[PDB]
Design a protein around this ligand. Structure first.
Ligand SMILES: c1nnc2n1CCCC2
Ligand SMILES: c1nnc2n1CCCC2
Ligand SMILES: [Mg+2]
Ligand SMILES: [Zn+2]
Ligand SMILES: [Zn+2]
Ligand SMILES: [Zn+2]
Ligand SMILES: [Zn+2]
Lengths: 131, 285
């Protein structure tokens, strides 16, 4: 009974991060030890004529980005663990995330390590026009 | 190919919206095309769902620098025989709003301890994962008729894990700097460990030079077995699966070949006692 949500290639990384005290440090250490990035993300078929903003209500990828469903890019959503804030809520789940094409091999790792500019809504170091 | 780890156990006939689905597999079929997904304006997100996610299928075979391995060799388990604690869990089945997973009900240890927990699962919502009580039924059978009263005699997991840490600390403070759980068909016990175990790099106690065996979420501190009062998590435990040593039959039939003083009272603690006993006889004779 029930419907599978995962593939066997993700078992090791998800099990490791699901038991960790610090899951974010666990995933970065997993990658640093040669471990494969989390796969089976929700990659979107989109026009690539979007605004380029980082977190959007609809896919907004430009020609240098890939759009993904937000929950699928969140380590906490992928591992079914607590989100690291007092309210315990997610900023990616229920939204779409634009990831640079060069980093689309690891969408979970990208959102973990990067921040969105509060002023222009673009990723810092990847489209943020502010100084 | 798919795994049973994180299997969606809800009875909802539709899948998830692309923004809420943790994976491509769990996205509803309406949104799938060309090996990708599409956003369909007019088909909105679901803001009220509660989907039970199965914790059956964990695989602790990570190779990460500075993170000790949970599953140890027979030769390393032999060196740490003073740390051996037999462990078994009798579970109950998810029911009503979910079907397809087992939840911890009776946790048994070779120390003779049985702890009853409220049936609790990991339920996905539009905002997060809610660790909460779920509807459950004891396994359909007559050798599990003793589990029916336990459905109403359970304690909340925040209490159960404090009791586990306390029992292990009392038992192991003068015996070892570790815990080695001695298991038989480890699957469900590893699932049950998700409810009271945390892992990471090796740490030291906050009050002494001994290695840390316990963790506290409230203070983000680590403690050895001597200073863990009030701690809620078992930190960096070790374990071994006795079933994997080439035995052909079930636990009781292999145990009974070497020992005639541990009867099968059919309770979780009794299986944990038999598991450790068989491990002792097989390893040291
Ligand atoms: C659920 N998802 N993240 C969290 N929670 C509960 C409270 C701690 C943080
Ligand atoms: C039984 N199960 N675990 C233990 N024992 C007796 C000796 C101490 C540790
Ligand atoms: Mg049993
Ligand atoms: Zn999330
Ligand atoms: Zn900016
Ligand atoms: Zn100490
Ligand atoms: Zn025995």
């Amino acid at each position: 009974a029930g419907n599978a949500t995962e593939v066997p290639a993700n078992s090791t990384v998800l099990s490791f991060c699901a038991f960790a005290v610090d899951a974010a440090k666990a995933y970065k250490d997993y990658l640093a030890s040669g471990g494969q990035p989390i796969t089976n993300c929700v990659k979107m078929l989109c026009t690539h004529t979007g605004t380029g903003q980082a977190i959007t209500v609809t896919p907004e990828a430009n020609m240098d980005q890939e759009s993904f469903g937000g929950a699928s890019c969140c380590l906490y959503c992928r591992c079914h663990i607590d989100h690291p804030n007092p309210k315990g809520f997610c900023d990616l789940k229920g939204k779409y995330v634009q990831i640079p094409t060069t980093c689309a091999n690891d969408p979970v790792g990208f959102t973990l390590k990067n921040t969105v500019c509060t002023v222009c809504g673009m990723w810092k170091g990847y489209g943020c026009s502010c100084d | 190919n798919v795994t049973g780890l994180f299997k969606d156990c809800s009875k909802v006939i539709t899948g998830l919206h692309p923004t809420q689905a943790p994976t491509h597999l769990s996205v509803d079929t309406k949104f799938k095309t060309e090996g990708l997904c599409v956003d369909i304006p007019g088909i909105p997100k679901d803001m009220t769902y509660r989907r039970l996610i199965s914790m059956m299928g964990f695989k602790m075979n990570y190779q990460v620098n500075g993170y000790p391995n949970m599953f140890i060799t027979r030769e390393e388990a032999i060196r740490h025989v003073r740390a051996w604690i037999g462990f078994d869990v009798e579970g109950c089945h998810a029911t009503r709003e979910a079907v397809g997973t087992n939840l911890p009900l009776q946790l048994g240890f070779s120390t003779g301890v049985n702890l009853v927990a409220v049936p609790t699962g990991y339920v996905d919502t539009p905002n997060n994962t809610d660790f909460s009580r779920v509807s459950a039924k004891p396994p359909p059978g007559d050798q599990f008729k003793h589990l029916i009263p336990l459905m109403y005699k359970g304690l909340p997991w925040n209490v159960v894990r404090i009791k586990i840490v306390q029992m292990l600390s009392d038992t192991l403070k003068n015996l070892s700097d570790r815990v080695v759980f001695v298991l038989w068909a480890h699957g469900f016990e590893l699932t049950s460990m998700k409810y009271f175990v945390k892992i990471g790099p090796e740490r030291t106690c906050c009050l002494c030079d001994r290695r840390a065996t316990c963790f506290s979420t409230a203070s983000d501190t680590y403690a050895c077995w001597h200073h863990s009062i009030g701690f809620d998590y078992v930190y960096n435990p070790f374990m071994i699966d006795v079933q994997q040593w080439g035995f052909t039959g079930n636990l009781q039939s292999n145990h009974d070949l070497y020992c005639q003083v541990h009867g099968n009272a059919h309770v979780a603690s009794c299986d944990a006692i038999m598991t450790r006993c068989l491990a002792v006889h097989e390893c040291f004779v």
